Symmetry: C3
Amino acid sequence: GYTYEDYKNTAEYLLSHTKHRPQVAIICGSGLGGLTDKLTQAQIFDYSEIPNFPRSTVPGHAGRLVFGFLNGRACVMMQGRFHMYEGYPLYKVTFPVRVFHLLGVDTLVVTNAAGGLNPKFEVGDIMLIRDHINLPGFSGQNPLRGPNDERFGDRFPAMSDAYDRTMRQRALSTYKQMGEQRELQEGTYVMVAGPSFETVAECRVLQKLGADAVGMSTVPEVIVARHCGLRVFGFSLITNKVIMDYESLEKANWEEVLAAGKQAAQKLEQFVSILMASIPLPD
Amino acid sequence: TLMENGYTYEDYKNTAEYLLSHTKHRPQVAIICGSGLGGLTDKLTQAQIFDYSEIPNFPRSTVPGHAGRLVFGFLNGRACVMMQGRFHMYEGYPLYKVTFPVRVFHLLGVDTLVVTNAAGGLNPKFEVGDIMLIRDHINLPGFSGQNPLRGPNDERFGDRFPAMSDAYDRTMRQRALSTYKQMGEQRELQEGTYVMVAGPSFETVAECRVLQKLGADAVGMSTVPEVIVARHCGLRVFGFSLITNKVIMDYESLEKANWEEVLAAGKQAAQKLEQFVSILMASIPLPD
Amino acid sequence: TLMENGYTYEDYKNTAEYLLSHTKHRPQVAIICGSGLGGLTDKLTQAQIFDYSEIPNFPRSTVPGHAGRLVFGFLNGRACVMMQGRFHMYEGYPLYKVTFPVRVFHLLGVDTLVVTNAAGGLNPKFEVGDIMLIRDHINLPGFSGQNPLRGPNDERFGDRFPAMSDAYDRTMRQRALSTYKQMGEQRELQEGTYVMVAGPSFETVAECRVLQKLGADAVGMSTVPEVIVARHCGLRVFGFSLITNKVIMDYESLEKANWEEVLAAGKQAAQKLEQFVSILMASIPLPD
Ligand SMILES: Nc1nc2c(CN3C[C@H](CO)[C@@H](O)C3)c[nH]c2c(=O)[nH]1
Ligand SMILES: Nc1nc2c(CN3C[C@H](CO)[C@@H](O)C3)c[nH]c2c(=O)[nH]1
Ligand SMILES: Nc1nc2c(CN3C[C@H](CO)[C@@H](O)C3)c[nH]c2c(=O)[nH]1
């Protein structure tokens, strides 16, 4: 899809257009665009200004790349992201990850909204992503499909350790700092392509498969990130409980999802601030 | 290099107008007849027939048992339009071509879609010749990206993220099941989850068993993408499978699924189907 | 804008005719060599070697442990053509390229295909170094639309809806199991279901757990497309995996799948593999 030079071009475009030198990249999903609010000395890029960048066409995805310091830390944030249901191939969806690597970022934080499949979750919960299930990947939709470029990484990268074990413990301990009543949740994110929401039968297959939450993003970004050796941390905001019986009259919808994010804005902001303090310095 | 719908709003609109200007029929219900079920268009009174090839932007049915004709008429008194034959992803069509007619039906003023198919039996309680109402579906091609709504959303048709949890109209299902206990038939009207797989090869024994483990009662290679585009644009949806064979679930059996036996089960069932479609038409509400 | 086969019947013909004139070999059996199994061409007698690059229409092998050569000759006195290295969908190839050779073999007069691969053990009872006979497969890419038979069907090759429930030849299996339970190692022959996933990245723990729950004993990124195309054109098919690693199934292990060790386990088993493959030639019926 893209040449090595295409990524370099975008990398160089940004490097020459800002003095910031991010160490940490954060991708903000549906309703989590607010996480850019506590950035200091921010510099804003529209995705439309950036060579080779796709556009966010989804409500709650602003379409901006924001550099700054978050709680001391040098960040670049994706205020909005791309999804395969919008029609992008996965090499477009994940394009920014390898540009982050080329900017010298060494850690990727992925966030998303997710439907809750585990009965113990409540709307509003933060689930740490311990693992994932890549259903598009099983059948061919893997962002590494095609010729492998050794300058980014190996032909057959492993995913069994994709989610940093250290940052996960560190995030579990330091969670008492939030003073929140609900304990910090941990579990498996299954990616599904969408854009339509799950039937009850589908929700039940996803539960049987062992997933705790379901969304339509995140996995391709993580795969590309581990391919090029970035440390990865992920979490979902549980925005709704996916309908798991034929008696409920509730149905999933996007407005409720954006609204759950708006209500949890401060909780998330605190969580992410604390998290920056837990990322080790480079070298 | 973005994976989108090839058709424009104009395209659907033109097909709608060509159809509206070349027939006086004004259907409320559209019905899609699957493999061996072309026979459902028999009791159409005042039938008028289009070959798919006449109709601008229409795909062709290449599969045996799919006649490739669009038939307007009345069925048990109700104004219908019927797809005698349908389209499948395994023929090589993108899902946007497979489901193309569903948006045409909407623009014609149809407010109800009934989707029919042949399906392999996964639930061991099902006998060849049973009718299984579709209570729900498992969209495997959709899990991994094969979804007819992939790409730019058109708000003229519907929402970016429609829900599918209520796809199969409950009331019609209640109504059809009630009616059928009075028929005092030898076999029960079955109800269950249809799973879509892409095809065109039939399941291995290990695949049949994953499908049973996922909770599907029937398997086929169609229907789901149509149900999704229909719910997207607000049609009431009803679905049924004619169970045409039992999927091989053990290594002993020397039997194999085959397309001939599938079409032969359609012939054998012509009476049950005809009788069932009656109950069905009298279960569909009147416009307003 | 159909997703059809990009090869014409004549394409296959040209490749076959080219091969048939440039060698005096006439294979009855074709064998596809998986990752680290390139060494199976060693026992071939009177070998004639083609590089894939010479053969018209042939895809190129881009993966380590995949030599990229076609090798005719005799194995335990039986006439063979061996693919020394194969093609995978993760390389970027569509399934009509991945499986291109299978139909050429058919045109060459081949009537039996033996597919080999390396695979990750999902069944706890398996050990690195085991040979697992493929009793069956679970085709995940196929469920969602990645089937090499998608698009127009060419009747000159086969049927529009070939059954796969009898894909792995039952007779060859029994016969191989017998011969082996009288000669070889003390470590007995394994049998099970091979699940294809696309790759090229290795499984999460979560994913490993899914594949286990679906009832797979081994996982790989190949094999299934070639089998489907072979069964489609009426080849007898036999398959086996070399378990080259045990897939990580808990969060406590500090082991990780890696391709270098996969190839290492191929080296380790090279002798065991040859001994078994002779026994195998003796189980293949002769043409009438
Ligand atoms: N598949 C799925 N995804 C989500 C999400 C995640 N994204 C939220 C947004 C639509 O609201 C899409 O990009 C999916 C939240 N809830 C759900 C859900 O119930 N199901
Ligand atoms: N997948 C699948 N589909 C069917 C069907 C439904 N269709 C029947 C037709 C081929 O005979 C295809 O279009 C799929 C009947 N039996 C089976 C089955 O055993 N398996
Ligand atoms: N999916 C998968 N495949 C394999 C294989 C088989 N092939 C080995 C090669 C990478 O080493 C790929 O072509 C897949 C061995 N082990 C595994 C595994 O753990 N997982």
